[PDB]
Amino acid sequence: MADKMDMSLDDIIKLNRNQRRVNRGGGPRRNRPAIARGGRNRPAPYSRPKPLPDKWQHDLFDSGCGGGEGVETGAKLLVSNLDFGVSDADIQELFAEFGTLKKAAVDYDRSGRSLGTADVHFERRADALKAMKQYKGVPLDGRPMDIQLVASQIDLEH
């Protein structure tokens, strides 16, 4: 067997499969309340734990959080419907007309080059959602204007 040490491996099989790693308690049985270490007795007020019965959404982000990275919940708006000479300040004035703007600068897109398409950034996702619902489909010249949300309200996506 190339062992000459354990000798009876069959014994190991039985002993190791029926081994006990905690002879100071434990027991894989559903008889005694399994508090584990710090479960149950921690969030419980006194009567019973309250997992937030009026939870508006869910524990997607958490039951309650308040952090970030500089972009705690930044909203990126995509906009497309202009001419060519559209600059950052230009489209910024535009979405300012659409509300308090933080930053908005233009991009060059699938149409060859310039078109007015821009990146609009706000701190609020709903403001962006309203933006991408309200102004989306709204005619502006011979065609309706485009405005969609990216990396913002998409936090629901899992």
Residue spans per domain, the chain? 1-60, 61-158
C-alpha 91/C-alpha 135 separation (Å) is 14
Please tell me the chain's helix, strand, coil percentages from 3-state DSSP, rounded to the nearest 5: 20, 15, 65
DSSP state of 13: H
3-state secondary structure of 104: strand
Distance of CA 20 to the CA centre of its chain: 42
* Residue that is written with structure tokens 């939870």 in the block: 55
CA distances from 121 to 115, 124, 137, 156 (A): 19, 9, 20, 19
Of 83, 90, 139, residue with least CA distance to 119: 90
**Class of the 61-158 domain?**
alpha beta
SS3 at position 111: coil
Q: What is the DSSP string of 36-73?
A: TTTSSTTT--SSS----TT-SS-SSS-SS----SS-TT
- Asked whether 25 and 32 are in contact (CB, 8 A), the reply is no
Question: How many C-beta atoms lie closer than 10 Å to residue 121's C-beta?
Answer: 18
d(CA 140, CA 94): 12
Report the DSSP pairing between strands 146-150 and 118-122: unpaired
Burial 60-80 (b: 16+ CB within 10 A, else e): eeeeeeeeeeeeeebbbbbbb
CA distance 68 to 91: 27
Give the integer Cα–Cα distance in Å for 95 and 93.
6
| CA gap 95, 145 in Å, rounded | 13
Of 77, 57, 60, nearest in space to 127 by CA: 77
Show the tokens assigned to 39.
């479960």
